[PDB]
Amino acid sequence: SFDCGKPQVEPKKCPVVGGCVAHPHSWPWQVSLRTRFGMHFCGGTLISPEWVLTAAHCLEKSPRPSSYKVILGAHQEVNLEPHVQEIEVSRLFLEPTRKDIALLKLSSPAVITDKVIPACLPSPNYVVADRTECFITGWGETQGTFGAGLLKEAQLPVIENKVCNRYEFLNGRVQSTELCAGHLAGGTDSCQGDSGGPLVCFEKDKYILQGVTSWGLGCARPNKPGVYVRVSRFVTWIEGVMRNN
């Protein structure tokens, strides 16, 4: 009884390196991906009770679903609250054109609560406009900024691909199935441990998943925005996997 994309605790939305610590449970689709006996190493986004979207490179350690588990409803990176859901992964579906996106099927459906709610997917092939303010979240490296060990958020503007691909920026590296976000001055960015997590943009009354954290030329460097897989180019594929599996 919770609509996708609508947090039950309002996000702080403060103007992960930089940014701020999120209000607990204000990003209820945020997933922590772990190995069977391991700690957090990547993020993900709950997109339905049985399905988590992440980056394909987060599965490089093992091709077997039994190697992975997801933590839902968390705020701490290490000290799990006495209400979080821990669910083993049952299947791995990597994007077939070899782009950096993958679906995890959960061994049992997540219980949807005020703290665990799926994100909404965009319309197929939607292109986020230049300068749109979006939010990235995760438990990654902070490079000396406050908030290590807690779920962090940062608000970053999207940079259109034609700009991001200029020589002084990312010099032709960014593909049409990727998008860029960040401040050219640097200082605020997703970082190691944030891969696979969400980039969301607010539209009307809910948050829409537009990016999956993927790579960068470092983190938070001036003139080097972060790169995210463009979710809208994969919605049709995602829908097909869920429908057929």
């Binding site: 190493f41 980056a55 490179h57 590296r173 190691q192 790579w215 030329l217 470092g218």
Partner: peptide, 14 residues
């Protein structure tokens, strides 16, 4: 110079 944002990062010569 590309590095993924996983722990640990996967890095490339560029």
């Amino acid at each position: 110079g590309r590095c993924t944002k996983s722990r640990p990062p996967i890095c490339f010569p560029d």
